[PDB]
């Protein structure tokens, strides 16, 4: 019956080994939607640098699945906050999801 199914937004938390003043990587794993597309934009238009919105993959289930990641300092993991705006135009679904640590 469903022509459309909104997507589920889960936080790929930064690596707890972190330190030194080094690189960390976080993200927003956008799982089990259909149909394409899924635009992923970060903090709503202001953190575009180092961002790689990966191509969607068709699960043996038939629902879609895209990983959306961003490299930022292992030193800005605490003050700033990282907000992934996954906008799903087909199902009219908008789910923001906070990416903060474990």
């Amino acid at each position: 019956p469903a022509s459309t199914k909104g997507p589920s937004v889960f936080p790929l938390a930064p690596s707890s080994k972190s330190t030194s003043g080094g690189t960390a990587a976080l993200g927003c794993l956008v799982k089990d939607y259909f149909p394409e597309p899924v635009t992923v934009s970060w903090n709503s238009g202001a953190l575009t640098s180092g961002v790689h919105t990966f191509p969607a993959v068709l699960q043996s289930s038939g629902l879609y699945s895209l990983s959306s990641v961003v490299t930022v300092p292992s030193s800005s993991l605490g003050t700033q906050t990282y907000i992934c705006n996954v906008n799903h135009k087909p199902s009219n679904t908008k789910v923001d999801k906070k990416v903060e640590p474990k």
Binding site: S20, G21, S75
Partner: protein, 207 residues
């Protein structure tokens, strides 16, 4: 803010296939002013860049910035000098470091093989020695091989300044006494600027 200059590895500049490089490391670049500017010079020329290539990182409570300059085997072998200039706003003046191969005319290394002492062949393992003397500069590389493969249980002393002003060292390969007796043949390969194709070789057996 500290800066350390690193030269390419001895083999890198001896083999056209390898890639020799000069690395400039900067440690203790405060969290506040992480801006670091590199300027490279090859005999005082190139304030205007070159190959160059920086990256950026974070540590204890400071920053570490690495810049890498690929060099030309003959530029290095021809004694050219490489300058790394590190400018940081949190620095009174820029810090400059410079490196190159030691000045001096290249002397060919003499490589001799030395079989174990009679008084050692009473142990399960013996020592096959490879003497390399009279070379200059000290940049050099030593290795062991028995058959079409490397022997990995050996050690090389660091180079030592002889009365000559040339350099000498010893590499000690350790073999199961059982092998050395089976008539096996070993060989140490020495790579130096002053050797024909930057390479010579000597054999050692039990005959």
């Amino acid at each position: 803010p500290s800066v350390f200059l690193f030269p390419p590895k001895p083999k890198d500049t001896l083999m056209i296939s390898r890639t020799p490089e000069v690395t400039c490391v900067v440690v203790d670049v405060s969290h506040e002013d992480p801006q670091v500017k590199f300027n490279w010079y090859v005999d005082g020329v190139q304030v205007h860049n070159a190959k160059t290539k920086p990256r950026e990182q974070q540590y204890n409570s400071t920053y570490r910035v690495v810049s890498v300059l690929t060099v030309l085997h003959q530029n290095w072998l021809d004694g050219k000098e490489y300058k790394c200039k590190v400018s940081n706003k949190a620095l009174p003046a820029p810090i400059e470091k410079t490196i190159s191969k030691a000045k001096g005319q290249p002397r060919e290394p003499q490589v001799y093989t030395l079989p174990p002492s009679r008084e050692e062949m009473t142990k399960n393992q013996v020592s096959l020695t490879c003497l390399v003397k009279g070379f200059y500069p000290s940049d050099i590389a030593v290795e062991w091989e028995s058959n079409g493969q490397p022997e990995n249980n050996y050690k090389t002393t660091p180079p030592v300044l002889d009365s000559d002003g040339s350099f000498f060292l010893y590499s000690k390969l350790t073999v199961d006494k059982s092998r050395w007796q089976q008539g096996n043949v070993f060989s140490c390969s020495v790579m130096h600027e002053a050797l024909h194709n930057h390479y010579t070789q000597k054999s050692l057996s039990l005959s």
